Amino acid sequence: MNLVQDKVTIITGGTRGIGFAAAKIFIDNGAKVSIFGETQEEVDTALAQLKELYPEEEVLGFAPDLTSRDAVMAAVGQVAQKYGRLDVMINNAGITSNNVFSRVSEEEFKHIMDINVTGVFNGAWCAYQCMKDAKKGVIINTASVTGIFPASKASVIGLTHGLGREIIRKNIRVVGVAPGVVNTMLEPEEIANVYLFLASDLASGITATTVSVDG
């Protein structure tokens, strides 16, 4: 089965955990996958591991600062330059707090918001600019548990519902995934399998909503 056959796909946070599991599952299902990661070194490690699994598959990797819309746009532009289009944007990157509320620093809080909310907005915005005249595309936003208490989780859910209803006219689907607690309990593959379904044409009826995955 090849549920995402020939779908040009970007996976943010694609060097570890759910993201990396999604990269494998998407390659298995016929996608043309590119990963974004935190640093180019982490990206290159993940690309080497993917090459161990899929020696014949081309996989691009980039490390834009997700908090910079310009950097995200440049990296999206390179993917579109290679393949001519972007079919699926998976805003999967997210972080968790070290601390509970009473002890979280202003700097940690803003950093969580920066990755979990601004990063997802940036990925969605950039993917939209790329897909808006194609009358086809899927943007999947991951609403990860904040660690603090969630706040960032609910923001991505709101982002997903609002954006989905606003651009429904353009035939771009926008869908969320709210995972529970994952193993480095859900396995990462169990979340990635949901990405897979949502990216596929089997989910053509699903937009402007978020799927809870708990299990």
- In 10 A of CB 84, how many CB atoms? 8
- As a residue count, the chain comes to 215
Q: How many residues bind a copy of itself (CB under 8 A)?
A: 62
Rank residues 1 and 84 by Cβ distance to a copy of itself and give the closer one.
1
Whether residue 94 is annotated as binding a ligand: the answer is no
Query: Could you say which of 55, 56, 81, 102 contacts a copy of itself (CB under 8 A)?
Result: 102
Q: In the window 32-51, what residues touch a copy of itself (CB under 8 A)?
A: none
Closest by CA position to 64, among listed 51, 48, 53, 75: 75
Query: Could you say which of 139, 152, 172, 199 contacts a copy of itself (CB under 8 A)?
Result: 152
For 206, residues 6+ apart whose C-beta sits below 8 A from its C-beta are 173, 175, 198
Q: Which residues are catalytic?
A: 153
27 in contact with a copy of itself (CB under 8 A)? no
Cβ-based burial of 115 (10 A; exposed 0-12, middle 13-18, buried ≥19): buried
Rank residues 57 and 65 by Cβ distance to Cl ion and give the closer one.
57
For 34, residues 6+ apart whose C-beta sits below 8 A from its C-beta are 8, 9, 10, 11, 59, 60, 61, 62, 79, 82
Rank residues 61 and 188 by Cβ distance to a copy of itself and give the closer one.
188
Whether residue 10 is annotated as binding a ligand: the answer is no
Residues engaged in binding a copy of itself (CB under 8 A): 1-3, 68-70, 100-102, 104, 106, 109-110, 113, 117-118, 121-122, 125, 128-129, 132, 146, 148-149, 151-159, 161-163, 165-167, 179-180, 186-187, 190-191, 193-194, 196-197, 202-209, 211-214
